């Protein structure tokens, strides 16, 4: 709803790239650009300060510069642990401010997901509410859609998806997208489908059931 | 060794107060300027604030200005974040950050330096639920999990067979239902054949709330 700060723009690499993030400062004279990277669950970490200094314990592959008004970061070699979130910083007018987020994330081919669709468990329609659950499991790239159909009718607004993070050896990705309705509302619907589309499938793969087998 | 270690955060409710402290170990923080940049979760950073005790000056983003307060205190080298009238968007993780003092006046800035782990600050009007555990039914290989719900607040660490099932496991991170209660998965992807014989429990931990469950699966009739 209200969102503080964007989320992280993704760019998709290999590992032996030459990446360079570029971030726009109006305020040049505030050369004073630093650059960090953030990996899931951790702090971030300093790389490049005063727009083109090495920090020191940062391998020498990132490098920074400036053209005029452009702060540019770029890494030569992209190595497996490089594949992370980068931040640019800047300060202006004392105060200091963060890009919005750049996620390398590693490249490979396209893979479709593996549907399943999970029932609720007769402890939860006992507690009054009915939760049908959708998996996607080791899928690339992270974009995919999951459409849920009751009764052959369209749903919108009664789900969650929940994507987790790239998998370091397989570099795929899993959804589960939650269906939660009431117990009222599941006991009058027969067919609950999961339509999934994804880049690697040629057509919608659906993965249905009928309440009670 | 410079190590900056955060505290205080935890559930507060919307319009209530909440004070961090950000105690740190290695060097001075007198001459030095100590900072407050948050996360939310699954977005970027954002600084909120900057202190200097030489100085005294305090400067704040302008997204917490007139609430938030920043401080330190050099008899314990710690500094603080005081938060009132916190509202939900300022659910976040709270990492203190330090900024070398100014040495040179051309290179006056040189990148926040070392950080802290960060401390999280769930604001919100809900109360410390337990976790309630449901198994997923399982219908080559064939997929099946615990649907673990209605819990307040973040986080819960999801185990199978005792810590002992680990590769397959996909354990995705919590949604924040419109109850105001967090609701996640946990799936895993285990041979059929070993359906029957070897026994599926996951261990859900909640630690805020003391809940250790452990709910078996089993395919249904």
């Known amino acids: 709803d209200i969102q503080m700060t964007q989320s992280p723009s993704s760019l998709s690499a290999s590992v032996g790239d030459r990446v360079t993030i570029t971030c726009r400062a109006s305020?040049?004279?505030?050369?004073?650009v630093a650059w960090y990277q953030q990996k899931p669950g951790k702090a971030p970490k300093l790389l490049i300060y005063?727009?083109?200094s090495l920090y020191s314990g940062v391998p020498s592959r990132f490098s920074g510069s400036r053209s005029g008004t452009d702060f540019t970061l770029t890494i030569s070699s992209l190595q497996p642990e490089d594949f992370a979130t980068y931040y640019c910083?800047?300060?202006?007018?004392?105060?200091?401010?963060f890009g919005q987020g750049t996620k390398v994330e590693i490249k490979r081919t396209v893979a479709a997901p593996s549907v399943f669709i999970f029932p609720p468990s007769d402890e939860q329609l006992k507690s009054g509410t009915a939760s049908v659950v959708c998996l996607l499991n080791n899928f690339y790239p992270r974009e995919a859609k999951v459409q849920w159909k009751v009764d052959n009718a369209l749903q919108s607004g009664n789900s969650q998806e929940s994507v987790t993070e790239q998998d370091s050896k397989d570099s795929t990705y899993s959804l589960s997208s939650t269906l939660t309705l009431s117990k009222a509302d599941y006991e009058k619907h027969k067919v609950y489908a999961c339509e999934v589309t994804h880049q690697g499938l040629s057509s919608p793969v659906t993965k249905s059931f009928n309440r009670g087998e | 060794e410079v190590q900056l270690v955060e505290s205080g955060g935890g559930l507060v409710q919307p319009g209530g107060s909440l004070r961090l402290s950000c105690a740190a170990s290695?060097?001075?923080?007198?001459?030095?300027?100590i900072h407050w940049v948050r996360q939310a979760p699954g977005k970027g950073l954002e600084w909120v604030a900057e202190?200097?005790?030489?100085?005294?000056?305090?400067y704040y983003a302008d997204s917490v200005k007139g609430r938030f307060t920043i401080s330190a205190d050099t008899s314990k080298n710690t500094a603080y974040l005081q938060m009132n009238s916190l509202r939900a968007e300022d659910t976040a993780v709270y990492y203190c950050?330090?900024?070398?003092?100014?040495?040179?006046?051309?290179?006056?800035?040189?990148?926040?330096?070392?950080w802290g782990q960060g401390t999280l600050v769930t604001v919100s009007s809900a109360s410390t639920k337990g976790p309630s555990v449901f198994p997923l039914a399982p219908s080559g290989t064939a997929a099946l999990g615990c649907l673990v719900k209605d819990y307040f607040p973040e986080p819960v660490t999801v185990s199978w067979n005792s810590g002992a099932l680990t590769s397959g496991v996909h354990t995705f991170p919590a949604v924040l239902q419109s109850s105001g209660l967090y609701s996640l998965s946990s799936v895993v992807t285990v041979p059929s054949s070993s359906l029957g014989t070897q026994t599926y429990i996951c261990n859900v931990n909640h630690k805020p709330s003391n809940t250790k469950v452990d709910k078996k699966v089993e395919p249904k009739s």
């Open positions: 950050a330090r900024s070398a003092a100014i040495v040179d006046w051309y290179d006056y800035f040189k990148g926040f330096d070392y």
């Open positions: 290695g060097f001075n923080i007198y001459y030095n300027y």
């Open positions: 202190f200097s005790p030489y100085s005294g000056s305090t």
């Open positions: 305020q040049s004279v505030s050369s004073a």
């Open positions: 005063s727009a083109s």
């Open positions: 910083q800047q300060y202006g007018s004392y105060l200091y401010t």
